[PDB]
Design an enzyme around this catalytic site. Structure first.
Site, PDB file in Angstrom:
ATOM      1  N   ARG A  31       4.976  -0.806  13.385  1.00  0.00           N
ATOM      2  CA  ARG A  31       5.515  -0.003  12.293  1.00  0.00           C
ATOM      3  C   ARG A  31       5.728   1.439  12.737  1.00  0.00           C
ATOM      4  O   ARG A  31       6.827   1.990  12.602  1.00  0.00           O
ATOM      5  CB  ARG A  31       4.579  -0.063  11.084  1.00  0.00           C
ATOM      6  CG  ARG A  31       4.451  -1.443  10.455  1.00  0.00           C
ATOM      7  CD  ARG A  31       3.357  -1.472   9.394  1.00  0.00           C
ATOM      8  NE  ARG A  31       2.039  -1.191   9.950  1.00  0.00           N
ATOM      9  CZ  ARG A  31       0.925  -1.111   9.235  1.00  0.00           C
ATOM     10  NH1 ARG A  31       0.930  -1.290   7.924  1.00  0.00           N
ATOM     11  NH2 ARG A  31      -0.224  -0.844   9.850  1.00  0.00           N
ATOM     12  N   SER A  74       0.798  -1.221   0.000  1.00  0.00           N
ATOM     13  CA  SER A  74       0.000   0.000   0.000  1.00  0.00           C
ATOM     14  C   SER A  74       0.836   1.280   0.000  1.00  0.00           C
ATOM     15  O   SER A  74       0.263   2.360  -0.174  1.00  0.00           O
ATOM     16  CB  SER A  74      -0.987  -0.008   1.179  1.00  0.00           C
ATOM     17  OG  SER A  74      -1.654  -1.264   1.306  1.00  0.00           O
TER      18      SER A  74
HETATM   19  C1  IM2 Z   1      -1.280  -2.498   1.942  1.00  0.00           C
HETATM   20  O1  IM2 Z   1      -0.186  -2.618   2.400  1.00  0.00           O
HETATM   21  C2  IM2 Z   1      -2.452  -3.304   2.436  1.00  0.00           C
HETATM   22  C3  IM2 Z   1      -3.153  -4.129   1.352  1.00  0.00           C
HETATM   23  C4  IM2 Z   1      -2.184  -4.694   0.338  1.00  0.00           C
HETATM   24  O2  IM2 Z   1      -3.859  -5.204   1.971  1.00  0.00           O
HETATM   25  C5  IM2 Z   1      -3.372  -2.462   3.349  1.00  0.00           C
HETATM   26  C6  IM2 Z   1      -4.086  -3.317   4.393  1.00  0.00           C
HETATM   27  C7  IM2 Z   1      -3.592  -2.842   5.730  1.00  0.00           C
HETATM   28  S1  IM2 Z   1      -4.087  -3.634   7.214  1.00  0.00           S
HETATM   29  C8  IM2 Z   1      -5.356  -2.533   7.903  1.00  0.00           C
HETATM   30  C9  IM2 Z   1      -5.607  -2.995   9.327  1.00  0.00           C
HETATM   31  N1  IM2 Z   1      -5.957  -4.407   9.399  1.00  0.00           N
HETATM   32  C10 IM2 Z   1      -5.934  -5.086  10.570  1.00  0.00           C
HETATM   33  N2  IM2 Z   1      -5.592  -4.479  11.672  1.00  0.00           N
HETATM   34  C11 IM2 Z   1      -2.727  -1.780   5.514  1.00  0.00           C
HETATM   35  C12 IM2 Z   1      -1.963  -1.003   6.487  1.00  0.00           C
HETATM   36  O3  IM2 Z   1      -0.838  -0.502   6.081  1.00  0.00           O
HETATM   37  O4  IM2 Z   1      -2.398  -0.824   7.615  1.00  0.00           O
HETATM   38  N3  IM2 Z   1      -2.603  -1.543   4.172  1.00  0.00           N
HETATM   39 CL    CL Z   2      -2.789   0.050  -2.509  1.00  0.00          CL
END
Ligand code: IM2
Ligand code: CL
Ligand code: IM2
Ligand code: CL
Ligand code: CL
Ligand code: CL
EC number: 3.5.2.6
Lengths: 242, 242
Positions: free
Chosen positions: B227, B47
């Protein structure tokens, strides 16, 4: 349009204060205030003039961008954060009046007057020194007039370049987290009574924007923190911020 | 002028984790990392590709501005914040992959490939599905390459419009207070091993900019908060933030 909620008066009386809070809900196009009369009373903008000042300076090329350094003239003034170099971002963060006085001089009385009227900013009267009219001159603006000016700036509707409005809104950044973003500008008027403190801006949510403009009597500098605190008490009471 | 400081490894070992933190002092033009080899190791951007993707979409007119609504397609997905309408701001805040996949389909393979070459972005290889290459395709970028890309973005030096770069930097807004501003983007790569979490961006101070790029092994989703937590631990240790 404007709904008076006198229940908010407790937020000032609990701090032995007097003032007005004005909220505008952009999605429902509704406004709220504790005091309708004071909401429409005009005061000296003081350092809240940094928003239109920075807009005009950027649009006219007086300021190239938010990275240009404005050198400190080596003269110590009472506010310690002034006695250093600044750019457009830190000039607004620390309300560096000498930087904005130099902006106004380079802009000139003629162009400052035309931009302020185009902005529909307050009473549009720059009577007094072009470098001090927002501190001891004739320009006056109400809380509701601040809201109207800020709403145009948010939508990029002011008669300046879109870039100028984007840069100034960047400089207005005050606080951000996972729940909200606040772009605002503080004000403290001391050279003419009544001594008042300003806080004007808006709260960006995921799916709404809440504009706000507040002023309050500020007899001594000890109550400057009440500008943000009283506003956040109203934002918390109205479910706008957690 | 890179400097390897293995003392930072304790911030990873305390959590039984492994990863790299990379810092770039823009004023002094010096870099710092705990693991130089991993700092130059390229992974799937996941992402964090939302930054270049939104830049290209904006510059090509696929996205008009940060207010344009991207309507939910109706498909219920695991992450509930994805099952709603989004704009450019909320799409980045919630890492809404379906929105960015729609961006990539409208940009197309040819324009996406050449934009990434113009950006000098990672290995510049978009091999795979046009709407998933940054998740399961051939694109690879290292932490030092992320910082290289972000420094161009900060100075508006990327070969897209200044407006598109300003809008994306607005969408990157994550946290701000009286001490610092953080513009960044999280990432979690789960389709291809190794599973890693990303955090890339920069910390804006009054007088300096600190660019950061970090990635760490993320076998389970319960360590995602590390992170930001480990990065702030490193930033606090270096006196960058209080
Ligand atoms: C990108 O890195 C991802 C995608 C490829 O799935 C998204 C999903 C998430 S997780 C959001 C929280 N979920 C559970 N706690 C992220 C993120 O960086 O947080 N990006
Ligand atoms: Cl993305
Ligand atoms: C603008 O409102 C003024 C300027 C006209 O004086 C500046 C000064 C201050 S605070 C000065 C006192 N500081 C500590 N005692 C502000 C402000 O909004 O905080 N703006
Ligand atoms: Cl001022
Ligand atoms: Cl900007
Ligand atoms: Cl911003």
């Amino acid at each position: 349009m404007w709904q008076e909620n006198k229940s908010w008066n407790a937020h000032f009386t609990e701090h032995k204060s007097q003032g007005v809070v004005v909220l505008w809900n952009e999605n429902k196009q509704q406004g709220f205030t504790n005091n309708l009369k004071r909401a429409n009373q005009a005061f000296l903008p003081a350092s809240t003039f940094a928003i239109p000042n920075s807009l005009i300076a950027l649009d006219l090329g007086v300021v190239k961008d938010e990275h240009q350094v404005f050198k400190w003239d080596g003269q110590t003034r009472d506010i310690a954060t002034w006695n250093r170099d600044h750019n457009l971002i830190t000039a607004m963060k620390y309300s560096v009046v000498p930087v904005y006085q130099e902006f106004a001089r380079q802009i000139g009385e003629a162009r400052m007057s035309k931009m302020l009227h185009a902005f529909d900013y307050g009473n549009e009267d720059i009577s007094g020194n072009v470098d001090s009219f927002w501190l001891d001159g004739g320009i006056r603006i109400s809380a509701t007039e601040q809201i109207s000016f800020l709403r145009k700036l948010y939508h990029n509707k002011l008669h300046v370049s879109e870039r100028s409005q984007r840069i100034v809104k960047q400089a207005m950044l005050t606080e951000a987290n996972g729940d909200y973003i606040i772009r605002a500008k503080t004000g403290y008027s001391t050279r003419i009574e009544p001594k008042i403190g300003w806080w004007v801006g808006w709260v960006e949510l995921d799916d709404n924007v809440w504009f706000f403009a507040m002023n309050m009597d500020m007899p001594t500098s000890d109550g400057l923190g009440l500008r943000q605190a009283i506003t956040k008490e109203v934002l918390k009471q109205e479910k706008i911020i957690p």
